[PDB]
């Protein structure tokens, strides 16, 4: 079966660590891929759930919601809390609410980068990044169609078509596209979903390569998106009752949309043994909007002292009243990303040479108009006795709210060289990066315009060492930098901040058996982190530090070709080591303990040839609810099955029908809080029915 040789074999293969094709060994940095037939098998609803059993990352700290594809690698989010996800190599560089997002069915691959990395990237959070693949044309013919229903009114169709147009293979396509309805967990909530993807393929000689690559994507509603107090959640409210699994505090009216365009290409030339040219262009548009009402904690949450609302209330009622907010954002975002490579391989004496070097450059613009409404902008919501109503977006009095309306420009221009220097069996990467950083904002309404220039350098240097048994000890050191967006008291953008890590680890993985397993250590410092002025000013200050520390291990492997086993284990420990307000306590929504168990066996010979059978285990320890640590969110675990049956049998070869089912015991835990007041309920049990035909 497919995915049995493709996670311990295929998954070997990879580019994320360094741009150029090299083993999983070869490799001085932690890095992690999920082949689609993995995807295939598992059925993942995003990019998130499909790193569910690698070690180092949280897939699910927004629960229920899935609206964006947003990653905590190694305790670290990325600057602003926007994603940081590439697609082809290139980076969909978002701003403010406009993130891009890639379904999962449209992904050939799905590597993860664990650490610092702007060697090759340019600025990047310090956790780590995530980078998709879009599926490629196939020269074999491909015909597939795809049915899915499930619970919460899941519907989805979709397609992947690919073919050769010419009779040699000179040219060749692929279409795939998907149409999905739902609804989502919460009351009144739902998402829909409609993507293409065309993308052809030119291959003009043997050494030639170009790879046209487009995405459309079009959301009427993308789902719910809000904030839970924990009071209902983590912890029995007043009257000792918990609010539901699917309590929704949003207007009725609530509406949030995307709408994604990309075009582009990847394009491959090799002269001859020595040089090989490589180049990376995407252009993309991408359009958010949202008209949204939000919690924002009880009324005796410390948090709305200022509400008259709340206020005018009896201090018993103050426990079970809930305040909110509201917002109206409309966004339009353009971006444009090249990166040309030049490789060359060559020796000097008992050296082996692979030597890699390129321009990469980004240039960004979001035009942000929003409007935000303010504290009392919105009716109390009586926990007791909720009335779900519609909210009037439109009526906006500078009593309760304002305005917001900035157009960001980002830029990115950088230099980068690496060579990979092998001596039989000792393997040596050292490179390193320059990077031209410029960003401006301006801001309309007040007239002003705030910009900065940033000139960062970093580099990194690691040795792997190849026993012939597949034991391949290595040890490495990287460096990451992420220039800042907020101001300072002085009136100017704050200095980058930055990442340093060492690691040391094994990796095994033998040429004659399929297995690969991983364990690592590392120390991961983030400086310059902004921190609480020492003085009542509002506003913030330089010189703070995080630092993290942990052990991931990872293991993948076919114990028979009717048996295969996927699971990680992963202990974090985060800390901030210098910060004038949560010095000593562990950054939120960070938990210590993680780990990972899937396993599934599939009947080739007897009456139930064809049938396969799999579950699974995610358990996610205990963490702090906030950043001072005054409360704690409560370990789980989630169980996960799942029942293929291959239709060979009734006729059809490559097709199968499939029943999947997570959270099997229909656990309730709320996956997370950044604050008081801001919770998340995990995802309710859910059932899925796929059909996937093959012609
Ligand atoms: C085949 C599944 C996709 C079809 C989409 C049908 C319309 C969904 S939405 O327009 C109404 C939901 O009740
Ligand atoms: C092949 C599946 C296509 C089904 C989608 C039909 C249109 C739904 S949406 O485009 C308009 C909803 O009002
Ligand atoms: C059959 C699935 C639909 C494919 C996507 C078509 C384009 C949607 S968006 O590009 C324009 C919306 O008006
Ligand atoms: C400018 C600071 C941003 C404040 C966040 C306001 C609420 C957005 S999110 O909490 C709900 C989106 O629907
Ligand atoms: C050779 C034995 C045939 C058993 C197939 C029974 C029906 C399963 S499939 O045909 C429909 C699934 O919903
Ligand atoms: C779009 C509606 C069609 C849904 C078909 C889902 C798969 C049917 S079979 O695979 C399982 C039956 O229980
Ligand atoms: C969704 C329509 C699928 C088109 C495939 C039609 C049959 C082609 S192949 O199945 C046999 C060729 O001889």
């Given at each position: 079966?497919?995915?049995?040789?493709?996670?311990?074999?295929?998954?070997?293969?990879?580019?994320?660590?360094?741009?150029?094709?090299?083993?999983?060994?070869?490799?001085?940095?932690?890095?992690?891929?999920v082949?689609?037939?993995?995807?295939?098998?598992?059925?993942?609803?995003?990019?998130?759930?499909?790193?569910?059993?690698?070690?180092?990352?949280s897939?699910?700290?927004?629960?229920?919601?899935?609206?964006?594809?947003?990653?905590?690698?190694?305790?670290?989010?990325?600057?602003?809390?926007?994603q940081?996800?590439?697609?082809?190599?290139l980076?969909?560089?978002?701003?403010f609410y406009?993130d891009?997002?890639?379904?999962?069915?449209?992904?050939?691959?799905?590597?993860?980068?664990?650490?610092?990395?702007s060697?090759?990237?340019?600025?990047?959070s310090?956790?780590?990044?995530?980078?998709?693949?879009?599926k490629?044309?196939?020269?074999?013919?491909?015909?597939?169609?795809?049915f899915?229903?499930?619970?919460?009114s899941?519907?989805?169709?979709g397609?992947?078509?690919?073919?050769?147009?010419?009779?040699?293979?000179?040219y060749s396509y692929?279409l795939?596209?998907?149409?999905?309805?739902?609804?989502?967990?919460?009351?009144?909530?739902?998402?829909?979903?409609?993507?293409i993807?065309?993308?052809?393929?030119?291959?003009?000689?043997?050494?030639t390569?170009?790879?046209?690559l487009?995405?459309?994507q079009?959301?009427?509603?993308?789902?719910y998106?809000?904030?839970?107090?924990?009071?209902?959640?983590?912890?029995?409210?007043?009257?000792g009752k918990?609010?539901?699994?699917?309590?929704?505090?949003?207007?009725?009216?609530?509406?949030?949309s995307?709408?994604?365009?990309?075009?582009?290409?990847?394009?491959?030339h090799?002269?001859?043994?020595?040089?090989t040219?490589?180049?990376?262009?995407?252009?993309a548009?991408?359009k958010?909007?949202?008209?949204?009402?939000?919690?924002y904690?009880?009324?005796?949450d410390?948090?709305?002292?200022?509400?008259?609302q709340?206020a005018?209330?009896?201090?018993?009622?103050?426990?079970?009243?809930?305040?909110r907010?509201?917002?109206?954002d409309?966004?339009?975002?353009?971006?444009?990303?090249?990166?040309?490579?030049?490789?060359?391989?060559?020796?000097?004496?008992?050296?082996?040479?692979?030597?890699?070097?390129?321009?990469?450059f980004?240039?960004?613009?979001?035009?942000?108009?929003?409007?935000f409404?303010?504290?009392?902008?919105?009716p109390?919501?009586?926990?007791?006795?909720?009335?779900?109503?519609?909210?009037?977006?439109?009526?906006?009095?500078?009593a309760n709210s304002?305005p917001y309306?900035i157009?960001?420009?980002?830029?990115?221009?950088?230099?980068?060289?690496?060579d990979?220097?092998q001596?039989?069996?000792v393997?040596?990467?050292?490179?390193?990066?320059?990077?031209?950083?410029?960003?401006e904002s301006?801001?309309?309404?007040?007239?002003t315009?705030?910009?900065?220039?940033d000139?960062?350098?970093?580099?990194?240097?690691?040795?792997?060492?190849?026993?012939?048994?597949?034991?391949?000890?290595?040890?490495?050191?990287?460096?990451?930098?992420?220039?800042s967006s907020?101001?300072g008291?002085?009136?100017?953008?704050?200095?980058?901040?930055?990442?340093?890590?060492?690691?040391?680890g094994?990796?095994?993985?033998?040429?004659?058996?399929?297995?690969?397993?991983?364990?690592?250590?590392?120390?991961?410092t983030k400086?310059?982190?902004?921190?609480?002025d020492?003085?009542?000013?509002?506003?913030?200050?330089?010189?703070?530090?995080?630092?993290?520390?942990?052990?991931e291990?990872?293991?993948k492997?076919?114990?028979?070709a009717?048996?295969?086993?996927?699971?990680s284990?992963?202990?974090?420990?985060?800390?901030?080591?210098?910060?004038?307000?949560?010095?000593?306590?562990?950054?939120?929504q960070?938990?210590?303990?993680?780990?990972?168990?899937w396993?599934?066996?599939?009947?080739?010979?007897?009456?139930?040839?064809?049938?396969?059978?799999?579950t699974?285990?995610?358990?996610?320890?205990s963490?702090?609810?906030?950043?001072?640590?005054?409360?704690?969110?409560?370990?789980?675990?989630?169980?996960d099955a799942?029942?293929?049956?291959?239709?060979?049998?009734?006729?059809?070869?490559?097709?199968?029908?499939?029943?999947?089912?997570?959270?099997?015991?229909?656990?309730?835990?709320?996956?997370?809080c950044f604050?008081?007041?801001?919770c998340?309920?995990?995802?309710?049990?859910?059932?899925?029915?796929?059909?996937?035909?093959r012609?």
């Amino acid at each position: 079966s497919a995915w049995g040789p493709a996670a311990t074999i295929a998954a070997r293969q990879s580019a994320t660590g360094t741009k150029t094709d090299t083993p999983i060994q070869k490799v001085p940095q932690s890095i992690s891929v999920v082949t689609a037939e993995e995807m295939a098998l598992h059925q993942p609803k995003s990019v998130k759930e499909a790193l569910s059993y690698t070690p180092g990352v949280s897939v699910g700290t927004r629960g229920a919601s899935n609206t964006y594809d947003h990653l905590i690698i190694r305790g670290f989010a990325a600057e602003g809390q926007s994603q940081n996800n590439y697609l082809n190599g290139l980076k969909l560089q978002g701003n403010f609410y406009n993130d891009a997002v890639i379904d999962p069915y449209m992904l050939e691959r799905a590597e993860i980068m664990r650490g610092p990395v702007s060697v090759l990237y340019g600025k990047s959070s310090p956790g780590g990044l995530l980078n998709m693949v879009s599926k490629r044309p196939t020269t074999e013919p491909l015909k597939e169609v795809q049915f899915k229903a499930g619970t919460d009114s899941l519907f989805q169709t979709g397609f992947d078509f690919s073919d050769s147009l010419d009779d040699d293979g000179v040219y060749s396509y692929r279409l795939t596209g998907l149409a999905r309805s739902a609804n989502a967990q919460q009351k009144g909530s739902e998402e829909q979903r409609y993507a293409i993807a065309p993308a052809f393929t030119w291959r003009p000689d043997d050494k030639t390569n170009f790879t046209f690559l487009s995405y459309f994507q079009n959301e009427p509603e993308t789902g719910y998106y809000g904030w839970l107090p924990k009071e209902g959640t983590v912890e029995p409210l007043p009257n000792g009752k918990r609010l539901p699994t699917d309590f929704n505090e949003g207007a009725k009216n609530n509406t949030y949309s995307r709408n994604e365009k990309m075009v582009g290409y990847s394009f491959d030339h090799e002269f001859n043994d020595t040089f090989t040219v490589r180049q990376n262009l995407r252009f993309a548009e991408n359009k958010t909007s949202q008209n949204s009402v939000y919690g924002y904690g009880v009324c005796s949450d410390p948090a709305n002292a200022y509400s008259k609302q709340c206020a005018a209330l009896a201090p018993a009622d103050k426990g079970h009243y809930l305040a909110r907010k509201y917002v109206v954002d409309d966004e339009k975002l353009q971006n444009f990303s090249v990166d040309t490579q030049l490789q060359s391989k060559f020796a000097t004496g008992d050296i082996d040479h692979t030597l890699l070097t390129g321009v990469d450059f980004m240039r960004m613009r979001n035009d942000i108009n929003a409007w935000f409404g303010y504290d009392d902008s919105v009716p109390l919501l009586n926990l007791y006795n909720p009335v779900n109503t519609d909210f009037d977006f439109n009526a906006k009095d500078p009593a309760n709210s304002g305005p917001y309306r900035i157009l960001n420009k980002q830029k990115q221009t950088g230099v980068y060289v690496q060579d990979q220097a092998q001596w039989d069996k000792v393997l040596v990467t050292l490179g390193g990066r320059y990077d031209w950083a410029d960003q401006e904002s301006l801001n309309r309404v007040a007239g002003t315009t705030d910009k900065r220039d940033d000139k960062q350098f970093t580099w990194r240097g690691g040795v792997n060492y190849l026993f012939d048994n597949g034991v391949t000890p290595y040890f490495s050191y990287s460096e990451s930098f992420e220039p800042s967006s907020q101001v300072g008291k002085d009136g100017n953008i704050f200095a980058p901040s930055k990442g340093k890590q060492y690691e040391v680890g094994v990796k095994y993985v033998p040429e004659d058996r399929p297995i690969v397993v991983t364990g690592a250590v590392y120390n991961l410092t983030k400086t310059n982190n902004l921190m609480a002025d020492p003085e009542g000013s509002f506003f913030s200050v330089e010189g703070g530090e995080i630092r993290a520390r942990g052990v991931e291990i990872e293991a993948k492997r076919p114990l028979s070709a009717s048996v295969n086993v996927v699971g990680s284990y992963t202990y974090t420990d985060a800390e901030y080591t210098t910060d004038t307000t949560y010095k000593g306590n562990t950054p939120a929504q960070v938990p210590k303990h993680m780990a990972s168990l899937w396993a599934d066996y599939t009947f080739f010979d007897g009456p139930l040839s064809g049938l396969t059978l799999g579950t699974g285990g995610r358990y996610t320890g205990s963490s702090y609810g906030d950043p001072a640590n005054s409360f704690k969110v409560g370990s789980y675990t989630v169980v996960d099955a799942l029942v293929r049956y291959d239709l060979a049998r009734v006729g059809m070869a490559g097709s199968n029908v499939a029943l999947h089912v997570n959270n099997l015991f229909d656990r309730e835990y709320v996956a997370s809080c950044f604050n008081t007041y801001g919770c998340f309920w995990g995802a309710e049990r859910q059932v899925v029915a796929t059909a996937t035909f093959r012609f």
